C-alpha cells in the first residue's frame, strides 16, 4: 500500500458527534444580559428596566455517497490478495473518510446558480466570524501571532485549546528556533540537533499543535478535468475595475506588476479544464482599484455549471493558484457573470486555525453513520453504495480564529 492509512485522519476523529432527528436542527443563543444605561438611582427611587437579547439559529443536513461495482466472473477466479469485495469496501470507506476530512475544512453551502442552497455544508473557513481574522500579508509565522490569536479568543470569553496548521508551516515555525541552540564547552561524542515545538503557553491558556497532512495551501491550476461529467470550458475577459478598496498594495515592494488570470467551471461531479489565460498589467496608481473579470458560460455543455473558481498567479510569476470561489448568476447557455478581484487572498500561501475544541462550541450532527446499501441486479455485475448524512455546527463563532496568507518555504 503506497497510499495513506487510517492514521492520517485527524480532524474527523476529534470533533464530537451528536445524533440528528431531522434535516433542520435548531438551537438558541444568549447574547446580552442587558443594555448599558447606568445603575445608580438614589434613595427611595424606582430604577429603570432592562431586557436581554436572545436568538434562534438553524442548520441543514447534507448527504454524501459513492458507488463500487464488481463483475460476476471476477468473483469466481482465485485472487492472490484475498477477497475483492472487502478490498473494495475498504477503499471506498477510506476515500469517503478523506473527502469528509477535507470537506470539514473547505466546504461552502452557498455555491448554486443565483446563490441558492447548494449541495455542500459549511466548513471551518466560512463559519468563523470575519472579525477574528489575522492577515500576515505574506510573512512567516512567529511567536507573537500565537499570543495575538490567543488574545482574540480570550477577549470573547473563550479558551484556546488547539492549533491546526499544515506540515510546511510547522516545519517553518520550528526552523525559527535554530539560532537559539547552545552548546557547553566540554563537548561529548555525539549530539542530537533540531528543535520541534509541540505546545505553547499563552497569557490566556495553553495551546497544543496538531499538524494535519490534508490541510494544504492554495490549490495550483491543473490542466486536466477531474471528471468526465464536469461542464464544458468557457471564456474569460479581464481589465481594470473601478473599485476603491483593493488590497493589491499590501504586498512587499508594492503591488504593481503583471498577473495571470484563469477560471474553471464546476458542478457537483467535478471540475472542467481551464479557460484561456489572460494577462493584466497593474500600474502603480491602480493598486487601489480591482480587476474586473467577465465570465461566459459554455454554449453546448452536457452538464450545467454551478460555481466558478478563480486562479491568479504570483506577481510577475508563471504558475497560477486558486484565489477565489463564487457561484454563477445563471446556468443558461451563454450566460455572463461579473466579478471584481480585490486581492483578499494571496497566491501560494497557507492558512491555519485556532480555537476552543469543546462540545459546547463545535459539534457534528449525524442523521445516520457510514453505512452500506445494496443495488438491484441490472446484469452480471454486483453493485453497492456507501452513504452518510450530517452537518457540522459551531455554536460560538467568535471562540475561533484563523491566520491567512502565511508564507512557508519548507518544501522548496
Amino acid at each position: 500500500n503506497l497510499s495513506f492509512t487510517d492514521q492520517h485522519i485527524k480532524f474527523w476523529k476529534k470533533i464530537p458527534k451528536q445524533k440528528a432527528y431531522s434535516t433542520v436542527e435548531q438551537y438558541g443563543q444568549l447574547l446580552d444580559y442587558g443594555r448599558s444605561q447606568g445603575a445608580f438611582v438614589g434613595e427611595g427611587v424606582l430604577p429603570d428596566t432592562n431586557d436581554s437579547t436572545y436568538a434562534r439559529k438553524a442548520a441543514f443536513v447534507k448527504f454524501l455517497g459513492t458507488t463500487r461495482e464488481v463483475t460476476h466472473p471476477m468473483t469466481l477466479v482465485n485472487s492472490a490478495f484475498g477477497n475483492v469485495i472487502a478490498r473494495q469496501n475498504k477503499d471506498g470507506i477510506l476515500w469517503m473518510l478523506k473527502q469528509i476530512e477535507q470537506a470539514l475544512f473547505w466546504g461552502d453551502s452557498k455555491l448554486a446558480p443565483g446563490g441558492q442552497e447548494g449541495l455542500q455544508f459549511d466548513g471551518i473557513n466560512k463559519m468563523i466570524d470575519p472579525e477574528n481574522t489575522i492577515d500576515l500579508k505574506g510573512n512567516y509565522l512567529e511567536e507573537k501571532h500565537i499570543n495575538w490569536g490567543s488574545q482574540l479568543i480570550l477577549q470573547n470569553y473563550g479558551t484556546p485549546t488547539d492549533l491546526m496548521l499544515p506540515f510546511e508551516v510547522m516545519g517553518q515555525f520550528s526552523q525559527e528556533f535554530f539560532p537559539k541552540e547552545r552548546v557547553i564547552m566540554p563537548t561529548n561524542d555525539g549530539y542530537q540537533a533540531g528543535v520541534v515545538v509541540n505546545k505553547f503557553m499563552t497569557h490566556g491558556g495553553e495551546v497544543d499543535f496538531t499538524p494535519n497532512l490534508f490541510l494544504n495551501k492554495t490549490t495550483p491550476l491543473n490542466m486536466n478535468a477531474s471528471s468526465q461529467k464536469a461542464p464544458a470550458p468557457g471564456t474569460l475577459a479581464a481589465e481594470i475595475g473601478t473599485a476603491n478598496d483593493a488590497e493589491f498594495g499590501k504586498q512587499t515592494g508594492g503591488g504593481a506588476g503583471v498577473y495571470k488570470y484563469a477560471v474553471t467551471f464546476n458542478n457537483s461531479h467535478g471540475e472542467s479544464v481551464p479557460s484561456n489565460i489572460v494577462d493584466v498589467t497593474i500600474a502603480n496608481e491602480d493598486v487601489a482599484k480591482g480587476v474586473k473579470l467577465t465570465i461566459t458560460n459554455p454554449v453546448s455543455t452536457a452538464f450545467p455549471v454551478e460555481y466558478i473558481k478563480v486562479y491568479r498567479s504570483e506577481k510577475d510569476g508563471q504558475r497560477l493558484y486558486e484565489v477565489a470561489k463564487f457561484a454563477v448568476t445563471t446556468d443558461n447557455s451563454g450566460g455572463v457573470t461579473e466579478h471584481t478581484d480585490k486581492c483578499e487572498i494571496l497566491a501560494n500561501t497557507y492558512t491555519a486555525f485556532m480555537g476552543e475544541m469543546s462540545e459546547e462550541v463545535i459539534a457534528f450532527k449525524q442523521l445516520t453513520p457510514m453505512m452500506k446499501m445494496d443495488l438491484a441486479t441490472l446484469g452480471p455485475v454486483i453493485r453497492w453504495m456507501i452513504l452518510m448524512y450530517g452537518v457540522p455546527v459551531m455554536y460560538a463563532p467568535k471562540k475561533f480564529m484563523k491566520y491567512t496568507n502565511i508564507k512557508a518555504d519548507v518544501p522548496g
Binding site: 431531522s22 436542527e25 435548531q26 438551537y27 441543514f60
Partner: peptide, 29 residues
C-alpha cells in the same frame, strides 16, 4: 417522490416537509 427539504418557515412547507416536526436542542448556549 416524497422529499424532506430544508425549509424553515412553517407556512412554506409543502410535500414531505409538512410531515417534519420541530427539532430543538434543550440547552441554551
Amino acid at each position: 417522490a416524497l422529499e424532506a427539504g430544508h425549509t424553515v418557515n412553517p407556512l412554506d412547507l409543502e410535500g414531505g416537509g409538512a410531515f417534519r416536526v420541530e427539532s430543538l436542542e434543550r440547552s441554551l448556549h
